[PDB]
Design a protein around this ligand. Structure first.
Ligand SMILES: Cc1occc(=S)c1O
Ligand SMILES: [Zn+2]
Length: 257
């Protein structure tokens, strides 16, 4: 099945998922000089005070922190979005080395990692119905650079031991996603897709300009995770990022002057 290696990696995905070569694939390179300030964007609103985390899961491609989305509790709205999008999970993509790991790039610059906070449009009732819609999802992307530690990331780093291999999960309640946000909400936005199979073209991407810093010791622990399941030959979970895809018929809008 699909993965990030030579034989089942991004260059292979089109075979099972032909939309891989579609008209609004992600990630993309953000050319900061071609992105246009858009004065028609409303301010962005990230309301995570009632967020309720439940569980953390190694799914063999990354780890997901999953949230209880059965009620109106952690929402994204405003910016390019119409209506209300509810947080369902976050995950990261990262590299084998600090020079690579983000999926989006900014003037061809690769960050050490990228955080994806995934939300579904509440007019569609649930996540499964939302991913059949062109405006079903909104993903808030945040770059990570290696420098100072992020304190609000450490509870996630400390639980990674317990989810080393594919299919392991642990209880992960009362995690506050606010502690993963940079100061500025300046962002670029464009229409795109999931960056993993099934690569559905259902996503409004909101990529923040300001990266958060995490420590080398924090990102080192992400790299100790495994793609394989327990008792299998060890393949470190590293380089689980898809490269930049053709922009095609799309414009990237900036929220800031
Ligand atoms: C599984 C999944 O869902 C939403 C967004 C992304 S990038 C992803 O991998
Ligand atoms: Zn992702």
């Amino acid at each position: 099945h699909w993965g990030y290696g030579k034989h089942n990696g991004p260059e292979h995905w089109h075979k099972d998922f032909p939309i891989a070569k579609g008209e609004r694939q992600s990630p993309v390179d953000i050319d900061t000089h071609t992105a246009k300030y858009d004065p028609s964007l409303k301010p962005l609103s990230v309301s995570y005070d009632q967020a309720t985390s439940l569980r953390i899961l190694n799914n063999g491609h990354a780890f997901n922190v999953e949230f209880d989305d059965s009620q109106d509790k952690a929402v994204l709205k405003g910016g390019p979005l119409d209506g209300t999008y509810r947080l369902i999970q976050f995950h990261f993509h990262w590299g084998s080395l600090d020079g690579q790991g983000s999926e989006h790039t900014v003037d061809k610059k690769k960050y050490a990692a990228e955080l994806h906070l995934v939300h579904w449009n509440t007019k569609y009732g649930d996540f499964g119905k939302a991913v059949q819609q062109p405006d079903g999802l909104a993903v808030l992307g945040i770059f990570l650079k290696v420098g100072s530690a992020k304190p609000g990331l450490q509870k996630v780093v400390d639980v990674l031991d317990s989810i080393k291999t594919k299919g392991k999960s642990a209880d992960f309640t009362n995690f506050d996603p606010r502690g993963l946000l940079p100061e500025s909400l300046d962002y670029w936005t464009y229409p795109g897709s999931l960056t993993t199979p099934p690569l559905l073209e259902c996503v409004t991407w909101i990529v923040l300009k300001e990266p958060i810093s995490v420590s080398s010791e924090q990102v080192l622990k992400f790299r100790k995770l495994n793609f394989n399941g327990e008792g299998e030959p060890e393949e470190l979970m590293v380089d689980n990022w898809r490269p930049a895809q053709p922009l095609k018929n799309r414009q990237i809008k900036a929220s800031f002057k």
